[PDB]
Each structure stands twice: as C-alpha cells, then as structure tokens.
A paper describes a structure:
Here, we take a structural approach to assess the relatedness of these eukaryotic-like proteins in Asgard archaea, the closest known prokaryotic relatives to eukaryotes. Asgard archaea roadblock, longin and TRAPPC3 domain-containing proteins form dimers similar to those found in the eukaryotic TRAPP and Ragulator complexes. Here, we adopted an X-ray crystallography approach to compare the structures of a potential Asgard Rab small GTPase, several RBs and two TRAPPC3 proteins to their eukaryotic counterparts, with a focus on Thor and MKD1. We conclude that the emergence of these protein architectures predated eukaryogenesis, however further adaptations occurred in proto-eukaryotes to allow these proteins to regulate distinct internal membranes.
Finally, we investigated the TRAPPC3-like proteins from Thor. The crystals were pink in color indicating potential Zn2+ binding. We scanned Zn2+ fluorescence for AB25 Thor-TRAPPC3 using X-rays to confirm the identity of the cation and collected multiple anomalous dispersion (MAD) diffraction data around the Zn2+ edge to solve the structure at 1.91 Å. We further analyzed the homology around the Thor-TRAPPC3 Zn2+-binding site. We found that the predicted Zn2+-binding sites and the experimentally determined sites are not completely conserved in positions of the coordinating residues, rather they appear in similar regions and appear to serve the same function in tethering the β-sheet to the D α-helix to create cavities. Interestingly, mouse TRAPPC3 has evolved to replace the Zn2+-binding site by a hydrogen bond. We speculate that Thor-TRAPPC3 may also bind small molecules, potentially being involved in ligand transport. The cavities appear to be accessible from the exterior close to the dimerization interfaces. Furthermore, we uncover structural evidence that TRAPPC3-like proteins exist in several branches of Asgard archaea and are likely to share a common ancestor gene with the V4R-like domain.
Author numbering:
A (entry chain A), B (entry chain B): 2 to 157
C-alpha cells in the first residue's frame, strides 16, 4: 500500500475531514475545498517555477492547456494522462490516473463530493493571475470510486 | 529560491495563518500546531514504513534517538544535522538545517512562536505509539530568523 508524499496527503485528509464536519452540504464542502485551493494557489504560483515558465497572455483554450501542462510538470513531474478539448464543449478536461490527493482514499455514498477539489481551486487561482475568468470543478474522483480523477475547466 | 514540496508548504502556511488569526496567544497557536502534528503523526505512522522499520520496545534515550533517525529517513530521506543527548540531559535535541516546513518563510516579530511546531506533534505522536511519554517543543525556527530549526524532545 505505497503512498507518495505522505505528509501532504495526511494534511489534506485533515482538511477534508475538517471541511466535511464544518459544512452543511456536499456542495458547500466542494466549494470550501475550492476556496482552500485558491488560497494556497497564490503561494504555489509565485513561489515556484510556474510564474517563470508561463506566459503573460493566456487567451485561448490551447493556451490554457499549455498552462495546465506547465503546472503539472512543475508540481508533479509528469504530464496529465489526458487533456480533452472536445468532449465538454467550451471546457478543457484534465485527467490524472494517479492523483496525489486521493491515494488509497475510499469514500462510499459520496459520489457528489469532489475530494480533490483543492486542485480545482489551484487552477482557478493560476488562471486568475492571468486574468482568465474560469470556473473549475471536479468531475470524477478515485476517492469516490472512479477509475481516474478528472477536472473540468470552463472558460466563463 | 527553489522550494521542495510546494503544495505541503503552502497548505501548512494556510493552516498557520488561520491558527494565528483564531487563537488568543502565541502559546495557544503553538499548541494548535502540535495538535495538528499529532493528528498527522497518526496517519504517517500507519501509512508509511516507520511502523515496519522501528523497534517495538523503545526503552533508552539511545533508542529514542535511533527512532528519530528512522522517522527522518522515511519522511525526508536524510539524517538530521544533529541529534544531541549531551547539551540537554534527559532530553534529545534534533537539529535540521534545511527544514521542509519553513522554506522561504520569514515572519516579522512573533517571539515565542514556533512556526514548525507541527513536527513537535508528529514526534510526540510517533513516540506515543511506542509507549514513550514525551513533550516536544521547537527551540528555534528559520521562519523567525534562526539559521536552523531545533526541536527538543523531553522524555517522561
Ligand atoms: Zn484525486
Ligand atoms: Zn522549520
């Protein structure tokens, strides 16, 4: 049962349980984890190579895709398993088969809960630095029984 | 200024700032960080090699020192810069010149605040799993301008 980055996932699991206990609904929990991601995305953008490797003018869905690839290589030393520009019209969908956030997590009866919504917030924060108004949510999470984690980035 | 594990560092930084805003004294903030550490410590003991690589019967000061070395190897893939059972008789002092928690943090003021007290709690929790009663506190932190981070493990 090998775990990568045990400190990070233990701290995140703590935040997830705290969030679930301090909110009234699954949707409120999703939004609170997104807010957490937006708050830590500020430091993650400025304190890492992301602010140096990304360009100032992010205009198109293809530019957003490139920006996502830069985030992934800087934070996780890999590419996303898929970036899908066509299935959700007006969106960019990102797939990760080995998400760091939910390793070995198994929640039942919580299919509406985006366990890894912190990453939705981190992407919204980075796009906001580029003055790209975006809405990001998690479509699927291995934590709730899916085969991969998938986030949906809508430029809106 | 390159940072190791930027997601962990930023998430922890969020926790510290929220803790400082919610507590009524620096020592209360210190205690909240140690309590977070104890919770993290439970997860890192159950979900890493620490439990499989450490002795079951920890009886001497020398045994506690070797346990600390194993924690450091598993969590950080390094040894502490110093483990001191000399300067503080009855306690064990751990020195880390490149602490993960406070990379690039430079607080102003905050005398008495241990930015990295989360690791005091992790240590206290692991020792507790080994039936070793300890109180752990941070002597100094690079976040408040020291050149090193030092934690003091007091036995009994
Ligand atoms: Zn995930
Ligand atoms: Zn430190």
């Amino acid at each position: 049962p090998k775990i990568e980055n045990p400190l990070l996932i233990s701290l995140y699991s703590y935040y997830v349980e705290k969030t679930l206990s301090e909110t009234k609904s699954i949707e409120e929990a999703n939004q609170r984890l997104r807010e957490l991601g937006k708050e830590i995305g500020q430091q993650v953008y400025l304190n890492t190579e992301i602010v140096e490797k990304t360009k100032d003018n992010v205009a198109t869905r293809e530019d957003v895709a490139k920006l996502i690839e830069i985030i992934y290589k800087v934070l996780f030393d890999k590419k996303p398993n898929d970036i899908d520009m066509k299935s959700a019209r007006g969106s960019v969908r990102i797939t990760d088969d080995d998400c760091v956030w939910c390793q070995e997590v198994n929640l039942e009866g919580m299919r509406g809960f985006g366990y890894c919504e912190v990453f939705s917030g981190i992407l919204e924060a980075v796009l906001e630095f580029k003055d790209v108004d975006a809405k990001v949510f998690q479509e699927m999470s291995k934590a709730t029984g899916a085969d991969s984690c998938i986030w949906n980035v809508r430029l809106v």
